[PDB]
From a paper:
Whilst HLA-A*11:01 favours peptides possessing Val, Ser and Thr at P2 and basic (Arg and Lys) residues at the C-terminus, HLA-A*02:01 favours those possessing Leu and Met at P2 and hydrophobic (Val and Leu) residues at the C-terminus. Structures comprising of HLA-A*11:01 in complex with the IBV peptides NP511-520, M141-49 and NS1186-195 were solved at a resolution of 2.08, 2.95 and 1.82 Å, respectively.
The 10-mer NP511-520 peptide adopted a canonical conformation within the HLA-A*11:01 binding cleft, anchored by P2-Thr and P10-Lys. P2-Thr forms a hydrogen bond with Glu63, while the side chain of P10-Lys is buried deep in the F pocket of HLA-A*11:01, forming a salt bridge with Asp116 and makes hydrophobic contacts with Ile95, Ile97 and Leu81. This flat conformation of the peptide is similar to the one observed for the HLA-A*02:01-restricted IAV M158-66 peptide. Structural overlay of the bound NP511-520 and M141-49 peptides, with an average root mean square deviation (r.m.s.d.) of 1.52 Å, showed that despite sharing a similar backbone conformation, the overall peptide conformations are different due to the exposed side chains. While stimulation with NP511-520 and NS1186-195 did not result in significantly increased CD8+ T cell activation, some donors had lower magnitude responses that were still above the basal IFN-γ+CD8+ T cell frequencies observed in the negative control (n = 5 and n = 4, respectively), which suggests that these peptides form subdominant epitopes with HLA-A*11:01. The lower conservation observed in NP511-520 is predominantly due to variations in position 3 residue 513N, which was more commonly observed in years prior to 2008, and from 2008 onwards, 513S became the dominant strain.
Residue numbers in the entry:
A (entry chain C): 1 to 10
B (entry chain B): 0 to 99
C (entry chain A): 1 to 275
Write the structure that this text describes.
Amino acid sequence: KTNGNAFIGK
Amino acid sequence: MIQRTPKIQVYSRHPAENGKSNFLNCYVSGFHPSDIEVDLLKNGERIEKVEHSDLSFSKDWSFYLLYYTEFTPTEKDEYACRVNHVTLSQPKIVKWDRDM
Amino acid sequence: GSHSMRYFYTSVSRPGRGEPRFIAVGYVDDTQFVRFDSDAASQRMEPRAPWIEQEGPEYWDQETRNVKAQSQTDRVDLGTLRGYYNQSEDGSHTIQIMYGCDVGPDGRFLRGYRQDAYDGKDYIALNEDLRSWTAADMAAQITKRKWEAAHAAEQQRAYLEGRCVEWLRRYLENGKETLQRTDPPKTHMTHHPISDHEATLRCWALGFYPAEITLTWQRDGEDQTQDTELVETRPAGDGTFQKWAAVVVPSGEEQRYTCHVQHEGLPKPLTLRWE
């Protein structure tokens, strides 16, 4: 299962 | 940026036996950037219906891909793999040597 | 034995030629089980191992959603990083992400990872404690401050110690017939005269799984790195791996050499020699 909780911009 | 040249290996999936079905592989690794041209050749000419792996990379971030095709080896057929990459002055041809 | 689950993502900008290309691959140990390619027809996460095909529609929908949002995040991050490094709009750039978790033979969580790169070099990485980051340079230090204010390490640790290991343990159970096996190498040696006073000895290891292997050459019991040509472990394409190590020897002295093979699938390590 991929991680979907950290789409936080660099 | 820093560019890394591909390491090329041409080989059969199973020990080669004339008249027996198999897979011819061309494994390219250790390269950066990811754009790469890979052709599998039979008697100097391009094989159509060549499949390839999904782009992945190693610990040092360098890419690797496997190009392959089903084939039946014969004593007279010559196989090779032609690779082009931004790090190369001209395409690099690596010949399949079954006897290594 | 011990096992791992890893995801590898790559985003490559192509200025003028459209939006960045995004590729995602998932692995359990050395077995690929999923893939996504933004240039492929499906626009969905796809199965690459038979034991994942059984996952229901909800599984595939969420995995597709995640890789699509990851590709959008990388697309904005390509522009951000280009700005941090004061780079032109015309050159092609790469963002690579690796993450995943490892479990011990008792199934315990061993470690978690999250590492990000820019143009093939370290950019930012989650530390082993899963609570802090290591920025590679000054540009990555900007990212680190934004990631600290966003509790990003807490997000990673919650995934790595929760969903990551729980789903790895599920996959290990679902693909038990194949993921738990170890195929020992089938070994043999080849000999090639290269002149009238020298020969190559090549030690071969074929059809092994997992990929981890050690091939070592010795002369009169002393470890050899003089003439030891060692190729990268390569896939056979059927789920097994291959490797070889070769040494250049004086003609007539072939029997003073041995190749020692170490692999997890071997009842006991092997020693090979030219007969």
